[PDB]
Point group: C2
Chain length 438, copies 2
């Protein structure tokens, strides 16, 4: 009984409704997880360590009498580095070098500039005291997510990088812990979900309150991050695992099937969709899926996610393919076409874009950050407030000379008096100079 | 009869308890639920809810939402109504802000690696930006200029401004700044209902892509709750100044610097820290004498009574420790060598250094971002050789975690050596 991938056709009169249902259905409703997350956060804020241990036992299936059993010492990170193979260690170190060299070039620090009248302007740049990094538990946890976050934090000078990674059933991902060692993670707690986010955002007896929480999470972590927003810095709210592949039919159908499998194997709720105007090509991809799926090591996960949210979508032409892509609004887009830069102008709603037949989004999961450019010396030339900038605090400074305060004070007086904010005006006017005054 | 400002002393054993209370009126949970109710009502009832909340909270009469729309010609009219000096100040600041952001703008780019791989970003301006501007007198025109101008420089086609008009009062300097800054539409609405209307859209208020501009606790709380539905610039804290003084700045200056923040609104917080005990007495005297002379004395007095204080400390080191604990959004280092003090106060926001720099200069900046009004798509377009370099690293790591579809997807593109 070969697997029959779900098929959609934009020519069908019920296409918009059927695509609507594909993109929106949920087993666990919103507000259900959201109420659940809100209850976890308030419980961690009230009971601290005790709530973190209780929820870790329930949701991760862990045996831990106290919070001390949920702390991984840094020696355990070094032990992970020795347990992985030499080829895996070197691959991690190669990835870390490319990330580290890039963020070094982008790092900017404090500066001062003296104006003509003697007034000094500038910025004081200091690293955040503490950063919290969420790392998914189990096998489906890209070591990149450790490298792309902990390394720029350390390059910025963050003194304490705290990693939270759940260990469901005690399962530990040695490559993930080895990545943490290479990236300079300082402490690790074996916790996850909204509990970890709440513990990092508000602090418990054993988990330190951090200044910023980063990393990619499931719906529980993403929802918790949105709710602790304002209480603590956050990098982004990652959406569900998804890929949209757009193909003109000139890419190897086995490549395209495996590109769909790459996202489908991440988790059971993943969404993997292919759109193409080439009907014969779509049939070959369907054949490729049926032939390649049974012996995938994660075939059960791939089959579940493709059954729930996978599809091959037939469209009339390149224009309709871009229209469907814009409706889907994918955070990850694989433009597997001969002329990807020609398709891009008609792509209005897309995050990270993988172009051409030689670029799979699997490269995005392992060589770049979420919707970040590949780190190279060439791309380092283009500044970005992400990376090292995200782990720094900036304080504008102004140090007026006596004469500079007089010039600026006259302008401040005019506008403050015009608004009847007379304390503003008088404060500035106190510093206005008149050399003939004795 | 004369006002006696609150006094704290770090030499007191219970100083930490008093400072904790000073830094901690209307409860957050009370405001939070009101904000949640307002957002839900605007989402459900649209224009009707916006008009209702505007009548109730801004004390005006508006038959419909059409009475709450200001045409762009009203901004041009405002520019004709302000004084010559006010207009020149706004136009000079605008040129400096606009010229600066033109230089800093970065559009789409591509870089080609030696192996043929192309990397870059597709950069597009946001379609619409919403700008929150406080109503009435206590509304700095710099907030308009420094938000709307980078949006227009980025290429945002529609900058929508929301400004409440309490009892119908209009600030012509604010509207003139909006004219100069290129604001496209204006709605005379404020509070959480304005934030909700911009974030979700109503019949008359367009849904925007990002909401910027500082507001009081209702606006900040509303922005915190619409995050995710819409982009936001920041969540402002209470209006605040911490003055640190070594005792050698004129005490009337320091008192007025405290008054400058205290006059913004009744929940503003103005604190002074000094090791000089006699100086603090002089500032207390200056406050008592100057307060009844101020146009906004009632607001200043309420702010100082509720949240103000003069704090004695032992020395420069303890002054900075207290300052770092306060973590002020604005810090005025009214000392002889301010660059010697700053290293010990890393948790402060904007810094005003020396005896000649009042924090009021920050609110009325004369001019010297764009990135915040652009959307970016990261692009990777591997050559066959580039996909082999990246694929060899990805293949090993993916197979190490048994993510074999990741590995095989990358391995399809790996070329053999020789």
């Amino acid at each position: 009984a070969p697997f029959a991938i779900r098929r959609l056709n934009a020519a069908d009169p019920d296409f918009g409704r059927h695509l609507d249902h594909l993109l929106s259905w949920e087993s666990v409703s919103d507000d259900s997880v959201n109420q659940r997350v809100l209850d976890i956060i308030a419980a961690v804020r009230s009971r601290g360590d005790a709530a973190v241990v209780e929820f870790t036992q329930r949701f991760d299936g862990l045996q831990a009498a106290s919070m001390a059993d949920l702390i991984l010492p840094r020696e355990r990170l070094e032990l992970a580095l020795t347990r992985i193979t030499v080829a895996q260690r070197e691959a991690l170190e190669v990835a870390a070098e490319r990330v580290r060299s890039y963020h070094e070039k982008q790092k900017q620090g404090s500066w001062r500039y003296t104006e003509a009248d003697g007034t000094v302007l500038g910025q004081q740049v200091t690293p955040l005291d503490r950063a919290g990094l969420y790392v998914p538990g189990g096998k489906a946890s890209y070591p990149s997510s450790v490298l792309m976050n902990a390394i720029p934090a350390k390059v910025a000078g963050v003194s304490e990088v705290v990693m939270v990674v759940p260990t469901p059933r005690g399962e530990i991902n040695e490559i993930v812990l080895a990545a943490a060692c290479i990236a300079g993670v300082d402490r690790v707690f074996t916790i996850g979900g909204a509990q970890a986010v709440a513990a990092l955002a508000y602090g418990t007896e054993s988990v330190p309150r951090v200044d910023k929480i980063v990393g990619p999470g499931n719906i529980y972590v993403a929802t918790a991050k949105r709710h602790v927003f304002g209480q603590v810095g956050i990098d982004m709210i990652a959406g569900p695992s998804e890929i949209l592949v757009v193909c003109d039919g000139q890419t190897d159908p086995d490549w395209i099937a495996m590109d769909l499998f790459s996202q489908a194997e991440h988790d059971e709720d993943a969404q993997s969709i292919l759109v193409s105007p080439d009907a014969a090509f779509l049939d070959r991809v369907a054949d490729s899926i049926a032939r390649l799926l049974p012996t995938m090591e994660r075939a059960e996960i791939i089959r579940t996610s493709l059954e729930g949210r996978g599809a091959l979508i037939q469209v009339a032409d390149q224009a309709q393919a871009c229209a469907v892509a814009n409706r889907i609004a994918p955070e990850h887009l694989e433009l597997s076409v001969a002329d990807p830069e020609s398709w891009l102008p008609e792509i209005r709603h897309a995050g990270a874009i993988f172009m051409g037949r030689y670029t799979a989004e699997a490269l995005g999961d392992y060589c770049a950050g979420p919707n970040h450019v590949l780190p190279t010396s060439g791309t380092a030339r283009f500044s970005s407030p992400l990376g090292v900038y995200d782990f720094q605090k900036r304080s504008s400074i102004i140090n007026c000379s006596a004469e500079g305060a007089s010039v600026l004070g006259r302008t401040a007086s005019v506008l403050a008096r015009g608004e009847s904010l007379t304390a503003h005006a008088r404060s500035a006017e106190y510093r206005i100079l008149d050399e003939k005054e004795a």
